[PDB]
């Protein structure tokens, strides 16, 4: 509501009118790292401002506390703050303790104004009503979710704010209950921030092939978790692809020739940059379907490749070096027997960028490599600071990778993605054989204490990858109901478990009467309530509240409260 979709252009014009001055930079863009779509959105905004030639600054951030301290050091000269993928649900005014009177200037007259402007692009869903309504210094580029779902919430909020006694109770309790009901609901990203920014550019008419590519990448990254959102947005991106597509068709391939064409993007892993056999061997969906984690799954994989009539040796060959006959008839090969093995869902048409003779890349593979670069791009408080510094360095490395010129960095990211994926697969199979997953009847707890790959798992995204693979296998396992999934990873240097609360998910292909319903994630709220109740040291500072830290000894007591918690 605060800034609806229609008024994005107006907000942008206001930002210009305020911070546009070649004399100095008054625009600062706070960005929460560890989010592909956030990075894409930030890059798009950077390019836009570069066109507008408005000096500004980029501020990578990892934790809410980092954001707080960064705001503390802010200078009054800055009047525009862009928050990318963070702060939407929190009461930023409260969290940053912003006093309207401190910033109020030129209020007049039925008008208001302030010295600074906090623009929020954090499109999770459970928007902080105070930010939406209570605050004015807070600016939120809403996707219309408020005006389409929170109208009753708006009414209740404005009534409660209006209330300043049987009738008083008879109204206040209902409004409080309405607001609480809007609360106590798990977070679930609503839409691509990249999509919102692309829409804004369309409003400003800045749309170009590069911007569409960036939006595609952001949405594709979002896909894995919120596949429904990706499905909803896919037609729009295809429409834009057709809109910007050049007239020339089948133009002779030249180095300058660059195309972004839609064609079958088989739901595999690094197909173009890994042997077909490897791509299948590490495609989360593939392993979940065939349970490749068990050796019998590997046997079935060999059986499937034999059914394909593809020489296994060939299947392990480098994809770029496939024989032309197979490299082209793979379409028919997949058309046949994929249903026989139940892997028909793998077939997927998707965006695939390409340029000159250097080669081609699918948006999925590109975002995978971007995540790999983000993750492995390179006194306890100092150790955490250095780790987050490495994460920020990886953030900037990915930023550089976005440029086409730095194809070398993209290749490095591809290799890193391969290595991380294989390590994740090995760890997952070891876990499943170990049966570390414990059915607690409130969640399937799986705590990690083995040395190897533990160092890698200190990165929240690495843990998320492992948990995503585990969740894929579990959801495909019909025996397992959609229980909440808990992951923890002890850090020996800090002696803390990287607790992660991972929501369940219906089978990728699943799209029946159910699956339509979004299974919100209450992990964060449960963790926060337990932490407030208890005193076990933890770190909710991380923007992704579902991920938190805890002492090696504070874990099991915290886990005990967690299973004791009824919030989950």
């Amino acid at each position: 509501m605060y800034y609806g979709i229609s008024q994005f252009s107006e907000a942008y014009n206001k930002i210009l009118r305020n911070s546009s001055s070649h004399s100095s930079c008054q625009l600062v863009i706070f960005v929460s790292c560890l989010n592909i779509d956030a990075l894409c959105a930030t890059k798009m905004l950077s390019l836009l401002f570069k066109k507008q030639l408005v000096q500004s600054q980029i501020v990578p951030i990892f934790g809410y506390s980092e954001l707080r301290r960064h705001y503390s050091q802010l200078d009054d000269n800055i009047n525009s703050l862009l928050l990318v993928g963070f702060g939407g649900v929190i009461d930023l005014e409260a969290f940053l303790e912003i006093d309207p009177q401190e910033y109020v200037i030129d209020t007049d007259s039925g008008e208001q104004s302030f010295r600074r402007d906090i623009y929020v692009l954090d499109a999770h869903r459970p928007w902080n009503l105070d930010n939406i309504f209570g605050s004015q210094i807070i600016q939120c580029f809403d996707d219309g979710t408020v005006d389409d779902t929170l109208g009753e919430q708006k009414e209740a909020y404005y009534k409660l704010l209006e209330l300043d006694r049987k009738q008083r109770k008879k109204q206040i309790h209902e409004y409080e209950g309405v607001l609480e009901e809007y609360y106590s609901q798990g977070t679930t990203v609503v839409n691509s921030i990249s999509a919102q920014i692309y829409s804004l550019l369309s409003a400003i008419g800045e749309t170009n092939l590069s911007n569409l590519w960036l939006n595609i990448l952001g949405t594709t990254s979002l896909d894995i978790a919120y596949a429904q959102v990706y499905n909803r947005l896919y037609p729009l991106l295809q429409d834009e692809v057709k809109r910007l597509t050049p007239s020339s068709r089948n133009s002779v391939k030249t180095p300058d020739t660059l195309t972004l064409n839609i064609q079958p993007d088989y739901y595999l892993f690094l197909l173009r940059h890994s042997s077909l056999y490897d791509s299948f061997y590490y495609s989360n969906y593939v392993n979940a379907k065939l349970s490749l984690w068990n050796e019998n799954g590997k046997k079935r994989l060999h059986k499937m490749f034999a059914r394909m009539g593809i020489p296994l040796s060939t299947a392990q060959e480098t994809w770029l070096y496939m024989d032309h006959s197979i490299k082209r008839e793979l379409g028919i090969i997949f058309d046949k027997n994929l249903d026989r093995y139940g892997l028909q869902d793998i077939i997927r048409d998707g965006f695939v960028r390409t340029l000159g003779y250097r080669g081609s890349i699918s948006a999925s593979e590109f975002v995978e490599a971007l995540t790999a670069l983000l993750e492995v791009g390179n006194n306890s408080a100092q150790k955490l600071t250095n780790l987050r510094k490495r994460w920020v360095s990886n953030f900037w490395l990915s930023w550089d990778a976005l440029d086409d010129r730095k194809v070398e960095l993209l290749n490095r990211g591809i290799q890193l993605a391969q290595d991380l994926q294989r390590a994740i697969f090995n760890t997952g199979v070891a876990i499943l054989e170990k049966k570390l997953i414990k059915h607690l009847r409130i969640y399937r707890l799986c705590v990690l204490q083995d040395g190897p790959d533990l160092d890698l798992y200190r990165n929240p995204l690495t843990l998320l990858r492992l948990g995503n693979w585990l969740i894929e296998c579990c959801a495909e396992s019909e025996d397992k109901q959609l229980l909440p999934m808990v992951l923890a990873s002890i850090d020996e240097n800090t002696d803390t478990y990287l607790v992660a609360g991972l929501t369940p998910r219906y089978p990728r292909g699943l799209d029946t009467i159910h699956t339509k319903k979004p299974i919100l994630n209450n992990f964060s709220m449960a963790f926060q309530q337990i932490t407030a109740e208890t005193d076990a040291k933890v770190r909710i500072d991380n923007f992704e509240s579902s991920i938190i830290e805890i002492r090696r000894e504070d874990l099991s007591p915290f886990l005990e409260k967690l299973t004791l918690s009824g919030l989950l």
Binding site: K253, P255, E317, T318, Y321, D323, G356, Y357, R358
Partner: protein, 397 residues
């Protein structure tokens, strides 16, 4: 037919003259430079060729033996066009490849790989000596005296038996003078020790290289090779043919002081206790033995060898004697840090030379136990060190 060969040649010419990345005709420039240094040969990345057009790469893979010569001809034509002004000669250019794809273990190679461009690696065990290969021949007909010639390739011919303007069964003969030839080596490769299966002999295989690929490596050098699995009818089993490999390209697995080095050494000299630092640095695990460290430093440093005007020379190589494994570790460290060294505790195609000690020169020669060492008796060492010496030991260590 010849039209299709010309078409393939034209396609490769277009690839060379057009394949561009960013803003550089990498291959055009590379060819121009290689010509500029007279190195008439081009190296091509397979991935690049595929990117330009998969079809040419696939056709090459199908019939490498014939496709490759056409590609080399295209390279020659491009070189002439870019290096010599038209309407105003060069030799056939060697083509070098780099697939960088999945390898094939030496043992795994079999009939399946015949005539296929193979990509593998190993350690070169031995190197032959270069031989002549007739790229071009000058040919006289024995009776009618009809001149002619042949242009042969090192892939997949014999002197024609027919007169071509009875004259004879083979009236043609070679005129070595006008004919032209190239170099051709022969190398033997063994599978990687790791690649060797459990308790199995390491397999071995032989190759041939030519043109600029000649003399590019030496025995006992780990290397990765690209070539066509080839088979030749050795004069040395029914229907059994000897398998070899034609070396398309080589990559070295293992592959003077600048300003920085001399500056660092000068600063080291600036240090007053530099000598003490050294003594502290030799075999730190061997605590104590300070005099031993000092003597090690001295021996490593040698001495100012001088040759008098009368000719008699002043030796510069110092020789130190030591007296369990503590000394063994010391000598091991010495050889490790020694620029050149020979460590041996006394245990120690028609050509014979002197013993192991003879081969040692410069650097150092270490022996854990002379009291144990008696091979060739002491007198050999007596002479080799006192005198630094058909049977003369022209060594200095």
């Amino acid at each position: 037919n010849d039209d299709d060969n010309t078409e393939i040649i034209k396609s490769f010419k277009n690839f060379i003259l057009e394949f561009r990345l960013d803003s550089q005709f990498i291959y055009r420039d590379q060819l121009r430079n290689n010509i500029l240094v007279k190195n008439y040969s081009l190296t091509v990345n397979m991935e690049h060729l595929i990117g330009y057009n998969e079809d040419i790469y696939k056709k090459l893979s199908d019939e490498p033996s014939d496709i490759i010569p056409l590609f080399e001809t295209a390279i020659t034509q491009v070189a002439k066009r870019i290096s010599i002004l038209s309407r105003a000669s060069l030799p056939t250019f060697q083509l070098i490849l780099n697939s960088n794809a999945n390898q094939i273990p030496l043992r795994d190679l079999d009939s399946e790989h015949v005539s296929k461009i193979v990509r593998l690696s190993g350690i070169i065990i031995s190197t032959s000596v270069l031989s002549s290969r007739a790229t071009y021949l000058s040919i006289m007909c024995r009776n009618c005296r009809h001149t002619t010639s042949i242009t042969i390739n090192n892939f997949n011919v014999s002197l024609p038996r027919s007169c071509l303007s009875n004259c004879g069964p083979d009236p043609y003969i070679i005129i070595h003078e006008s004919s032209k030839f190239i170099d051709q080596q022969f190398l033997k490769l063994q599978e990687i020790p790791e690649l060797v299966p459990v308790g199995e002999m390491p397999r071995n295989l032989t190759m041939t290289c030519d043109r600029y690929l000649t003399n590019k490596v030496i025995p006992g050098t780990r290397v990765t090779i690209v070539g066509i699995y080839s088979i030749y009818n050795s004069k040395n089993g029914v229907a059994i043919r000897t398998p070899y490999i034609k070396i398309l390209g080589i990559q070295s697995d293992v592959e003077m002081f600048t300003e920085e080095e001399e500056e660092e050494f000068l600063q080291l000299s600036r240090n007053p206790k530099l000598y003490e630092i050294l003594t502290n640095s030799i075999a730190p695990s061997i605590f104590g033995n300070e005099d031993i460290k000092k003597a090690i430093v001295c021996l490593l440093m040698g001495g100012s060898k001088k040759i008098l005007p009368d000719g008699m020379r002043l030796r510069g190589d110092i020789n130190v004697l030591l007296l369990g494994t503590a000394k063994s570790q010391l000598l091991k460290f010495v050889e490790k840090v020694s620029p050149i060294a020979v460590y041996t505790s006394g245990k120690g195609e028609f050509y014979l030379e002197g013993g192991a000690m003879v081969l040692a020169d410069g650097g150092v020669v270490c022996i854990d136990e002379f009291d144990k060492m008696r091979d060739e008796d002491r007198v050999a060492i007596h002479e080799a060190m006192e005198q630094q010496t058909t049977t003369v030991l022209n060594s200095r260590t």
